[PDB]
Write a structure and sequence with these properties.
The complex is a heterodimer of chains A (about 425) and B (about 10). Chain A is mostly helical. Chain A is about 70% helix and about 0% strand. The longest helix of chain A has 19 residues. In chain B, about 0% of the residues lie in helices and about 0% in strands. Chain B has no helices and no strands. Chain B is rod-shaped and about 30 Å long. The chains are: A mainly alpha (about 425), B little secondary structure (about 10). Chains A and B meet through helix 5 and helix 8 of A and loops of B. Chain B: It is found in: Cell membrane; Nucleus; Cytoplasm; Cytoplasm, Perinuclear region.
Amino acid sequence: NWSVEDIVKGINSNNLESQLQATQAARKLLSREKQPPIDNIIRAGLIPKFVSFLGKTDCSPIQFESAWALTNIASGTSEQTKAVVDGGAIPAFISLLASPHAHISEQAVWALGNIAGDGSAFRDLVIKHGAIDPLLALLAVPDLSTLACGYLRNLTWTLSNLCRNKNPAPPLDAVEQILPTLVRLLHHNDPEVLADSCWAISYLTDGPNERIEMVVKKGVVPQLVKLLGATELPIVTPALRAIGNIVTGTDEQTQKVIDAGALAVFPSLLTNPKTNIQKEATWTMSNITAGRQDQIQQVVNHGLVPFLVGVLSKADFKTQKEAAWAITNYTSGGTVEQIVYLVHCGIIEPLMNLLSAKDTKIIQVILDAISNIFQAAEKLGETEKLSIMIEECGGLDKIEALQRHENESVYKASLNLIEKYFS
Amino acid sequence: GKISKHWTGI
């Protein structure tokens, strides 16, 4: 393991071979686990030299070594990635994509992935330099299965970074050019390719309805639903996120998710041991119950109300919070019959128990569900019958103490509930 | 987000 000083010497020699030996030595240093001396290599002014070696077509070994060395530097902080880009590395790396040498092309893929992964500005700059055509050409084979596994995973991951951040989101024509290939990857058998593919789709669906639409039009929902029930957490997580983003769109878009059979997967998702899965499953449910009355009926038919009642009863506070939203949306847009069914499932007790929460936000969401529920009772003149259940559980108190509160909306609704159904 | 590589060596 050479010293940075010696590496500088080798690179400064006008000896191609000496430069090769010094670059490899640089690569090995930047490969350590114990904090690679990235900042020193940068201050030493080596980046421009490395970028220069990327263009030495007659010495592929130094193309590889320097590509690798640059990749690890680009894998650092934004300041470090910026250094690589500032060195002119982008067009040099795109030129390597078409190298007859797979290991070199692969490093270029990897390098661009880290550059694009720094943020939207670098992501777009990489796109402006025309990285998309070359990248897509690499996956231009009839059956993905004939590609080396490790190589396919790298490309997938890099394409994923080209889909990622939101300020701004990737260029629309870039997304369109990418989608077809991305969809082939979403249908591939490698568990890692499947995971990153799902992350890419989850990014493309994090935005305006128009964004969700171009992904939905590619018929990916059914595959997403299938992945939604995979046995690997790494696949489930991004699939559920993508599903979650899609149900934030139009009711027509949400219906594609329900038609694909997504709801049958929620019994296990809403009881998943993984706190995060449970929380995003409930979130997804709250945007489904915010749909039409016929979609709320689908929630009911799949027997998901008891599951919502359960999560609201016992779960991480953040999961319970989404549950409240789900119930408030359900109570807000559902029929009288659907709301009655909700009460027969036992929503009152656990909903009351949450009024003690120390989070003003969940108290407003719940008092809202209570208003909604009473409003339904009113059409059944069974108001008084509910007004007792809420006393029973011991809610008449919490709504009572919620009069003498602090946040207006709260004691405004609290009080409004008292004088009208109780006192 | 970002990932570095490390092995080989000749």
